[PDB]
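Troubleshooting entry. The earlier prediction with adenosine-5'-triphosphate gave an output that would not parse, so I re-checked the input for stray whitespace and re-submitted. Clean input:
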Amino acid sequence: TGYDLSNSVFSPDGRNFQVEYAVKAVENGTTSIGIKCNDGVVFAVEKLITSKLLVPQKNVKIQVVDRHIGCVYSGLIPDGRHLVNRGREEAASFKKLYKTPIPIPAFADRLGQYVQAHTLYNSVRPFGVSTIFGGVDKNGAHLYMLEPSGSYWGYKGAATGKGRQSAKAELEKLVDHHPEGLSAREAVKQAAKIIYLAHEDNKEKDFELEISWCSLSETNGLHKFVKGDLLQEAIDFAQKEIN
Amino acid sequence: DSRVKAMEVDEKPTETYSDVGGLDKQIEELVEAIVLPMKRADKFKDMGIRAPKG
Amino acid sequence: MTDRYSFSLTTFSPSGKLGQIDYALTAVKQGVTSLGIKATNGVVIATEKKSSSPLAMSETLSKVSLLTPDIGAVYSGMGPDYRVLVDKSRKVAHTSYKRIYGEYPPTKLLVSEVAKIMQEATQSG
Amino acid sequence: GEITFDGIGGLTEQIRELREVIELPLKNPEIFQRVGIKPPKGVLLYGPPGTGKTLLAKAVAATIGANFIFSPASGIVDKYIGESARIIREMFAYAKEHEPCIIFMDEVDAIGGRRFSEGTSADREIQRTLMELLTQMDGFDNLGQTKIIMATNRPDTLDPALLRPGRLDRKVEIPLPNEAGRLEIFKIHTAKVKKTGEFDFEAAVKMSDGFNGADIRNCATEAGFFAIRDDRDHINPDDLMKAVRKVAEVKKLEGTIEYQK
Amino acid sequence: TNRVDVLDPALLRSGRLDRKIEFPLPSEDSRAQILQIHSRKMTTDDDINWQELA
Amino acid sequence: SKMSLAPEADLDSLIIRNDSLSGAVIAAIMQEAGLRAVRKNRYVILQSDLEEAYATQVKTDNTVDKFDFYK
Amino acid sequence: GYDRHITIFSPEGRLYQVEYAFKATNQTNINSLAVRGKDCTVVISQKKVPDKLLDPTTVSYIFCISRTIGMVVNGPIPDARNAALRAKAEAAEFRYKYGYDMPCDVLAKRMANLSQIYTQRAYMRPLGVILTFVSVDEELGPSIYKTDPAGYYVGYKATATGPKQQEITTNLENHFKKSKIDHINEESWEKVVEFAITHMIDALGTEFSKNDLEVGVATKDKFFTLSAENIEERLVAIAEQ
Amino acid sequence: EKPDVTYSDVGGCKDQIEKLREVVELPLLSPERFATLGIDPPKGILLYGPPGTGKTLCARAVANRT
Ligand SMILES: Nc1ncnc2c1ncn2[C@@H]1O[C@H](COP(=O)(O)OP(=O)(O)OP(=O)(O)O)[C@@H](O)[C@H]1O
Ligand SMILES: Nc1ncnc2c1ncn2[C@@H]1O[C@H](COP(=O)(O)OP(=O)(O)OP(=O)(O)O)[C@@H](O)[C@H]1O
Ligand SMILES: [Mg+2]
Ligand SMILES: [Mg+2]
């Protein structure tokens, strides 16, 4: 009763309850996946068309940080955007002192340390977002997914949203089919497939698919949006597969 | 007991499921759950499924 | 972030006495024993050593310390609040008698410096 | 409803722990004579609801073949008071005569009320019928040819005199079936039914976790309804993937997340 | 039931109530259909347009 | 003294760790020492079976003055 | 109620709030063992691998602080990295402020003190970590320091931490009776890792392949952890003996 | 057994007092007029408000007259 009320007070048995509660917010959000490839990394999110009044490709939820790190999130959608600010502030701060873009493992650590503060004190609220962010630098590609607790892990692939289960089982099967790492050029196509399957869950409102990629081979380490003809080939490929 | 013997059918007039405006899909799922594992109990026994208890 | 225990956490009982002061002694009574005997030409202070395992070597931990070269001190109660309390003590002995009279403090005066810390750990929220 | 040794697949280690208590000193009392520990007796089963505490009771009553008595606890409270004491006294005598005998108390949440006895007079009918089970189980009385297996949902209703080891040797917690103890549950229930030739389960179930055994046998019922619409005689691997996404959804409607002792 | 959030967590599960079916508020179609189901018995005119009311 | 044990098995280790126990929770642990032995099949109640039955059915129990810093 | 929500005394006189940190720890269930050699320290811990989708490198509960100090964490990993952060800061700092790199013991002290300042403030939750420092001082030889979120700490021949740590302690107590002396008499650091893994397999009863171990070794003026290949070299030497 | 509060006792000539007469009194005295329309006659009626206006003063009145 009184451990339920409180923030940042340990339960008798030893767990924080409001970390657990903060997970709920991740499952309300829409699907998003990352796929780590041999070249770099692909990001993709399901953007729900909740009315005929929204405009197409103008209410983009994919947001870069610097010019080599893709970011898309699930949780509470204002609360996402403010962590994409925080990231920018730290990114930029590193470029002043050490004159080089920030390394991707380092980008992870400091971003995490912010989340961690809001479970240290009782006075601000534990952040209600699970994020995917990653990109390529000199060490290579890295994928990360950050949980509201303040924990990240590296991954061959990761996913988040209400349709995480349906993507997690295909993602094993894209570690079996291609055990040496598929090319990122193949993986535009493979990304679409995994959104079109995890849309039966959110089949309530029709969708619009968004991919983006950052890889050393294609885009010269510069994160971009897949657009025009390359976006048309991936759409028609996953649509005719799942029907 | 005498409470259970009164609870027993008395034939209540149907209102018909077609005069219940809207809610098309809710009538099918209800029909699927209660009415059709009684009548078609051969196609549950070939398949090998159990009937939904409620 | 924002401290919101600006108010005091100690208050008088509607029966008189401060509630937390009284508790704090019962925690001292649980502790390890130790003793002190004043003699004519010296003092003796001494405590036992309570470990968890014979794996824990207790030689490394010191429960008797020096404040100044002439004033030692021994304790019972919360192990960690001894660690910091002795530090706070050594440090403010030095910033109130090492600069301003050279010599280490007389023994009455050092006791009183320690006493200011305690009172004050009850006044601030 | 009987079934032989198998019960909860994937927990054959837990099946042996119940036989250590029941079947090993029953058949051969010569192994507990030499070691010198007083014979055990008493097992409590508790876990997330929907897990087949009840299916194991059928497994250990069929195979042993000793006399079985399935006594629901809410099915011996009667209108007459002092009659729910006299009955249950006569049953412990009964288990001594017909030895070896096993008494399965099922749904002990009814007479799990604690001290209380400030509320209604019904709360003092419990306490008076429970004191008699306490001195009959342990007192001067100590019946050597009786075994008790007790099934309870929430294991914190219980009065603190029934939590209490030495009444009740093993305190078994049944776990929500494991990583591939949900998958062992699924391979015996898809044998029964007609499958196209389906073996694609493997990832799909593991990712639909959070599943009690009672929600694993609801997904084969829902995969033979998606089949009935198509008019199929076998379950497609598309009907199975429609059902697991459906079972989890509805099973998430409620959930305390019942945390064991 | 009217409120489902206070149903027991061993009454709410499978083996016991197999299907858990939800009765959504009539959408546009449902709304329109309702107004037609009661107005039918009573007297109607060519003026009544049940889409205007829905 | 009733049951059998090896002189390898020593009870005295278990006396000093935990300081709250009732007599019934000492009748169970010995039950649980001779059932772990029944899975090895080693007639004598070893020091592995006796130490493994103690570590089971003890719970969080951090009340004991041991799980502390008030010392 | 309100007594146990913040960090004030209970009516008994126990600070139950701190004791809820103690049980907060064991959620990962990583066992670890460390021991003092003649001139090198070893620390080993279990590598839990929860999936196959996760990259196995990042999974790591061994942190390097500095060119001397390795620090093994048993607890949640969100607190772990805040623990190593504030360690790194201070360890760095100490070189600047005091003219030489920070000794083992000294770091153990500062991390105790910091944990204590969260015990008095009614708006910081205590960290749930138990930290194990390992290093090789110049003077005090191989040393190990076990610290805890109350602020309490002591020196140790060999220590463990994890759900099953009572099994592991009792092995060590048999052995440092038979040696009749402080530490394993072994010059080669490789051959101390062998002796550790044998008394861990004893205690957990469970074997270890090259993807269940994390092994950290400390030597004089160098701290390194061991690669997937080098884990399998110290394991082939046990098995062929 | 028939209260003595009569039906003119209640204050004002409000239209609200006639609504009590259009849900209870009128369809039972003449079910001829609610049979021609086809409507299910309204059977309920709630009386609510601040005290002192007679919620029980108009429910006695309607028990005398009907
Ligand atoms: N382990 C299992 N193996 C095969 N079938 C199972 C298993 N567990 C549950 N079931 C299925 O679930 C149904 C109901 O479960 P059961 O009644 O045995 O669970 P329970 O834990 O006793 O729950 P409760 O007593 O709360 O109703 C069973 O009759 C069976 O179809
Ligand atoms: N509208 C009215 N016209 C004339 N007299 C009124 C009116 N409303 C109230 N009264 C007078 O006030 C007396 C008491 O009011 P009454 O007890 O009916 O209040 P109530 O509305 O039932 O409030 P509550 O039920 O909350 O106490 C009546 O017996 C009557 O004499
Ligand atoms: Mg049952
Ligand atoms: Mg009234």
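This one parsed fine. Residues D 53-54, 106, 151 surround magnesium ion (ligand 3) (CB under 6 Å).
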